[PDB]
Write a protein that binds this DNA or RNA. Structure first.
Ligand SMILES: Nc1ccn([C@H]2CC[C@@H](COP(=O)(O)OP(=O)(O)OP(=O)(O)O)O2)c(=O)n1
Ligand SMILES: [Mg+2]
Length: 324
DNA sequence: GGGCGCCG
DNA sequence: CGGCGCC
């Protein structure tokens, strides 16, 4: 099935390499986009030119296409499976924390294995230190069952501190993903707003106790409106440490709150995208009119997600659908 | 597409 | 402070 696949597949690879292997954001942007548009198309893309017809995709993209069309490969593409350097780079990116810049440097010092990484860890930054530490786990996804469990675990101590703490795990969860990547938890409490501005400690508390109780083990960031971290389940003799994150909002904006944290990357963007077009710019905070002159306006009334899409003249989508 | 928190 | 890597 799904016809224009191979090609798309092929397409993206390119992008990341250009993304990663080079900065070439621009090429990567295009590439990605190009991958997209090709997939949304409904016919067997025979002639790579046919494709060319198709908007966005251009001449060189166009080229890579037929190469593939003739024979299942692009040497450029093969180079990756060939050139050490780059193959190396990709790995590192597999590491949480280590993004390309740092990744390069790491190779630039011949650091080019997981093992290597260990060997002179000394060069890493903590965040990275932790990644390496945990590496293995991070590959394995979190199964819904646990996710549920975890969820609870949270809910408890949360409310225990103060009843008035809204907790809501979102992201993949809201999208009914049989397996999710990490705990994406939203948070709120009745006094906090655009007009209270402070109290971040509330955030600080949950974790505080979360840490105390023996949940979050590790701490990647303890910012005032956000927290990234690691945790893991309790045992009887073991399970993987899971990434975790919590974010707290000014209750008054709760709605963008669910929106963003849920969304699905692309999803949010589309919207956010559509929005600008429609005279607004959304945020995980608010939606405001783009007062033509440029100016983001005074926050829009948001009693539910609905309002948003509505505002945007877009049909509401219910979470599990959200994927695009 | 938008913004948060690390750090050098 | 960019500039990173993540969300
Ligand atoms: N640049 C970004 C990154 C994330 N998001 C939002 C959407 C959901 C959340 C990111 O959650 P992830 O955990 O990355 O996504 P997920 O779908 O929850 O994936 P996972 O299976 O890893 O939890 O933040 C966003 O709008 N823009
Ligand atoms: Mg990485």
């Amino acid at each position: 099935e799904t016809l224009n696949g191979g090609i798309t597949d092929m397409l993206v690879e390119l992008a990341n390499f250009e993304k990663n292997v080079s900065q070439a954001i621009h090429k990567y942007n295009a590439y990605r986009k190009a991958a997209s548009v090709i997939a949304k198309y409904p016919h067997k893309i025979k002639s790579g030119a046919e494709a060319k017809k198709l908007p966005g995709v251009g001449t060189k993209i166009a080229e890579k296409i037929d190469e593939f069309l003739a024979t299942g490969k692009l040497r450029k593409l093969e180079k990756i499976r060939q050139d050490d350097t780059s193959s190396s780079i990709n790995f590192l990116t597999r590491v949480t924390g280590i993004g390309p810049s740092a990744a390069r440097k790491l190779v630039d010092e011949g650091i080019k294995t997981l093992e290597d990484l260990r060997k002179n860890e000394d060069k890493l930054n903590h965040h990275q230190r932790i990644g390496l530490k945990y590496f293995e786990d991070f590959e394995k996804r979190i199964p819904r069952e646990e996710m549920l469990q975890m969820q609870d675990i949270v809910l408890n101590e949360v409310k225990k501190l103060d009843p008035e703490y809204i907790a809501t795990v979102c992201g993949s969860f809201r999208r009914g993903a049989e397996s999710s990547g990490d705990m994406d938890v939203l948070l709120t409490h009745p006094n906090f707003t655009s007009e209270s501005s402070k109290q971040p400690k509330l955030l600080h508390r949950v974790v505080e106790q979360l840490q105390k109780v023996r949940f979050i083990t590790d701490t990647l960031s303890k910012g005032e409106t956000k927290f990234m971290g690691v945790c893991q389940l309790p045992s009887e003799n073991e399970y993987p440490h899971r990434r975790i994150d919590i974010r707290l909002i000014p209750k008054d904006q709760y709605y963008c709150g669910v929106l963003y944290f849920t969304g699905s990357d692309i999803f949010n963007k589309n919207m956010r995208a559509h929005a600008l077009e429609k005279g607004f710019t959304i945020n995980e905070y608010t939606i405001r009119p783009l007062g033509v002159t440029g100016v983001a306006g005074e926050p829009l009334p948001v009693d539910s997600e609905q309002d948003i899409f509505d505002y945007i003249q877009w049909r509401y989508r219910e979470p599990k659908d959200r994927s695009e």
